[PDB]
């Protein structure tokens, strides 16, 4: 037993990380088959980032201006193209460590593992959630751009995130692997509103189920509620509205624990209105929303890869 | 910026995980050079675990009774020996993926990454601390025995933990890679007191420094204290006594932030006596003690491997 915020094993992604240099700028790239993917602002100086014209800046670059290094291996760049906010560098060698992979665009509230990298070298791995406002609260220092987020299903890596920007508020923004930003953000050093974030309600409920499975039961109350009544409370506390789709996804956890979803909603309502009175749930003094229902089932069942 | 509980990249350890079967019992093993390391209770049935005589049980085992499988590879066992609580299975093939490695016995309060495995396959990775009472609060289901804990320094993996037991209280116990248990525990299914745990004071202080570096400053107070006065408070709240060695380890963080250690101790004293008044520090509603001072410096500096 026990419940931890667990990342996927990072080995399959470690073998894909390379370093990309253009001029004075160095960041991380992702080497899959004979293409290296990286943030297009590798072509920007610090001064370019205030108001970059990427088309004009890229025209001034040729294949030989992009230095791609995989450990000690220098990769030969034979083509370059810009797709949305990512650069695709065609190289003359297929990465022999390319795993089975997909590019996916995840939904807000879904979770993934980030392999934080600097200069093409992995520094650590952690699990996080895409916030409802399409930011992530990561750990990204200078040079971490190009680090990727991923999920693994058996032997297949689903890449869902590439890091591009730290907003002035300290939260993080990035793209899918086709270079389309999550949320309204752009790769320019300017003020950018993220807009109101909310708590991922279905994830909180999943984690309450994880707590019951592990023996933390004090929050179980004698009340029930309705979907519409619960959502009146959810709106007041800036929680995502719960839908029947969410109720359906919690089905297996409800069946394992014998606790109807709306009963768990009533316990969560009482937690929202009365606080936690200095108690903890699974070692946390606040309601945790970074576990999806699938995450809870995975961890409580021991799914491997 | 941002601060996350980050595990080491697990790739170098993934390549060492194998499955070990003896009779009906299957668990994880660690394959380094031509030796596979695993918990000796792989030779026990469920009934053996109530009161096992490992010497007598092992005598009834021969080399061909140990099935060692690395993915799809079947390893040939050519010798077996028991070292304390671990079995060493000599195999006829050196693991071609053996990293540079050390076996280390860590101190209480130090942190490491766990690669949770089942049937020899990695399921996830997470960072945890060795508690002062020599337990860990992990995520370990049936079959996770033999999963290992490690740190990485550049290209060298320092193995410090192998999982053996879930205590009746739900916390976890294990050995170093020489098979010596951390703490008073034994590999027998019986009641085992862990004894009073305490909070890792130097880690809490390191995390307060991490918070200041990332802009969370509300807890900074106008008081100072003394080492002896602070420890009077530490004893009352079941915190580890702070020593000058701990003050010395916090030196670099004190110098970066311009906050004297005893000033930070005074802020922590006020947090202990008055609580956090419904506020958070680095997104946490309790005082976090699973980051060492070295962990904070690593993450705030971007050290890679």
The two tokens of residue A53 are 């014209």
B40 and B156 share one domain: no
The CATH number assigned to the domain holding B279 equals 1.10.1840.10
Distance between CA B179 and CA B84 in Å, rounded? 5
Distance between CA A99 and CA A14 in Å, rounded? 11
Distance between CA A66 and CA A68 in Å, rounded? 6
| Inter-residue contact A119 to A19 (CB < 8 Å) | yes
Helix-then-strand count for chain A, H and E? 8, 13
A86 and A35 share one domain: yes
Q: How far lies A69's CA from each of A20, A38, A184, A233, in Å?
A: 7, 13, 32, 53
Q: Other CB atoms closer than 10 Å to residue A100's CB: what's the count? A: 12
Backbone angles phi, psi at B158, to 5 degrees: -100, 105
The two tokens of residue A60 are 């001034």
| Inter-residue contact B9 to B152 (CB < 8 Å) | yes
Bridge partners of A161?
A: A149
CA angle B285, B287, B292 (to 5 degrees): 135
| Inter-residue contact A22 to A44 (CB < 8 Å) | no
Helix-then-strand count for chain B, H and E? 8, 13
Bridge partners of A82?
A: A87
A1 and A109 share one domain: yes
A20 and A135 share one domain: no
| Inter-residue contact A201 to A245 (CB < 8 Å) | no
Which domain does B108 fall in, by range? 1-14+100-197
B127 and B7 share one domain: yes
Distance between CA A295 and CA A110 in Å, rounded? 10
B22 and B92 share one domain: yes
A4 and A119 share one domain: yes
Distance between CA A156 and CA B275 in Å, rounded? 46
Rg (CA), chain B: 22
Helix (H) or strand (E) run with residue A272 in it: helix A261-274
Q: Other CB atoms closer than 10 Å to residue B245's CB: what's the count? A: 9
B122 in A contact zone (CB under 8 Å): yes
A128 and A264 share one domain: no
Closest CA to A162 of A197, A205, A114: A114
> To the nearest 5 percent, what fractions of chain B are helix, strand and coil?
25, 30, 45
Distance between CA B250 and CA B129 in Å, rounded? 18
| Inter-residue contact B25 to B19 (CB < 8 Å) | no
Query: Could you list the active site residues of B?
Result: 41, 145
Distance between CA A104 and CA A176 in Å, rounded? 7
Q: How far lies B108's CA from each of A181, B128, B201, B209, B305, in Å?
A: 44, 12, 12, 21, 24
Q: Other CB atoms closer than 10 Å to residue B255's CB: what's the count? A: 10
B150 and B255 share one domain: no
Which of A182, A197, A212 is the C-terminal boundary of a domain? A197
Closest CA to B45 of B62, B31, B60: B60
Closest CA to A18 of A7, A4, A33: A33
Which of B197, B232, B254 is the C-terminal boundary of a domain? B197
Please, which residues have CB within 8 angstroms of residue B118's CB and are 6 or more apart in sequence?
A302, A304, B28, B141, B143, B144
Q: How far is B303 from chain A (nearest CA, A)?
A: 6
Distance between CA A281 and CA A301 in Å, rounded? 20
The CATH number assigned to the domain holding A1 equals 2.40.10.10
B91 and B158 share one domain: no
| Inter-residue contact B240 to B132 (CB < 8 Å) | yes
Is B15 in contact with A11 (Cβ distance < 8 A)?
yes
Distance between CA B188 and CA B39 in Å, rounded? 12
**Residues of A whose CB is below 8 A from B121:** 304-305
Bridge partners of A117?
A: A122
| Inter-residue contact A68 to A83 (CB < 8 Å) | no
Distance between CA A80 and CA A78 in Å, rounded? 7
Which of A99, A121, A155 is the C-terminal boundary of a domain? A99
Secondary structure (3-state) at B191 = coil
Q: Pseudo-torsion of CA B105, B108, B114, B116, nearest 10°?
A: 100
Least CA distance to B123: which residue of chain A? A304
A94 and A234 share one domain: no
Listing DSSP states for A216-260 in one string gives --TT--S----HHHHHHHHHHTTBPPP-HHHHHHTHHHHHHHT--
| Inter-residue contact B28 to B42 (CB < 8 Å) | no
The two tokens of residue A234 are 């959810």
B146 and B183 share one domain: yes
| Inter-residue contact A24 to A68 (CB < 8 Å) | no
Looking at the structure of chain A, the number of domains it has is 3
Helix (H) or strand (E) run with residue B22 in it: strand B17-22
CB < 8 Å & 24+ apart, contacts of B61-69: B61/B22, B65/B22, B65/B23, B66/B20, B66/B21, B66/B22, B66/B42, B67/B19, B67/B20, B67/B21, B67/B22, B68/B18, B68/B19, B68/B20, B68/B21, B68/B29, B68/B31, B68/B36, B69/B18, B69/B19, B69/B21, B69/B120
What is the distance, to the nearest Å, from the Cα of residue B151 to the centroid of all Cα atoms in its chain? 9
What is the distance, to the nearest Å, from the Cα of residue A64 to the centroid of all Cα atoms in its chain? 33
Is A10 in contact with B10 (Cβ distance < 8 A)?
yes
Three-state SS string over A23-71 comes to CCEEEEEEEECCEEEEEHHHHCCCCHHHCCCHHHHHHCCCHHHEEEEEC
Distance between CA B177 and CA B85 in Å, rounded? 9
Distance between CA B35 and CA B87 in Å, rounded? 10
Task: Choose from A2, A128, A174, A299 for mutation: most chain B CBs within 10 A.
Answer: A2
Is A124 in contact with B9 (Cβ distance < 8 A)?
yes
| Inter-residue contact A264 to A209 (CB < 8 Å) | yes
Chain A residues 260-279 with a CB less than 8 Å from chain B: 275, 278
What is the distance, to the nearest Å, from the Cα of residue A157 to the centroid of all Cα atoms in its chain? 14
């Amino acid at each position: 037993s026990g419940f931890r915020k667990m990342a996927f094993p990072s080995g399959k992604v470690e073998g894909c990380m390379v370093q990309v240099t253009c001029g004075t700028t160095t960041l991380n790239g992702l080497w899959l088959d004979d293409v290296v993917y990286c943030p297009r602002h590798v072509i920007c100086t610090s001064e370019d980032m205030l108001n970059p014209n990427y088309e004009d800046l890229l025209i001034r670059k040729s294949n030989h201006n992009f230095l791609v290094q995989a450990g000690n291996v220098q990769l030969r760049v034979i083509g370059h193209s810009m797709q949305n906010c990512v650069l695709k560098l065609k190289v003359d060698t297929a990465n022999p460590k390319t795993p089975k992979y997909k590019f996916v665009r995840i939904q807000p509230g879904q979770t993934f593992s980030v392999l934080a990298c600097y200069n093409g070298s992995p520094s650590g791995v952690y699990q996080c959630a895409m916030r409802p406002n399409f930011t992530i609260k990561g750990s990204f220092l200078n040079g971490s751009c190009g680090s990727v987020g991923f999920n693994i299903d058996y032997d297949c890596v689903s890449f869902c995130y590439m890091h591009h920007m730290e907003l002035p508020t300290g939260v993080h923004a990035g793209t899918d692997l086709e270079g389309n930003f999550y949320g309204p953000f752009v790769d320019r050093q300017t003020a950018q509103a993220a807009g109101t974030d909310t708590t991922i309600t279905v994830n909180v409920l999943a984690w309450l189920y994880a707590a019951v499975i592990n023996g933390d039961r004090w929050f179980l109350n004698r009340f029930t509620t309705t979907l519409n009544d619960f959502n009146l409370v959810a709106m007041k506390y800036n929680y995502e509205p719960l839908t029947q789709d969410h109720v359906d996804i919690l089905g297996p956890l409800s069946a394992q624990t014998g606790i109807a979803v709306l009963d768990m909603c009533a316990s969560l309502k009482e937690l929202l209105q009365n606080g936690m009175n200095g108690r903890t749930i699974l070692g946390s003094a606040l309601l945790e929303d970074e576990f999806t229902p699938f995450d809870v089932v995975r961890q409580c069942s021991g799914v491997t890869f």
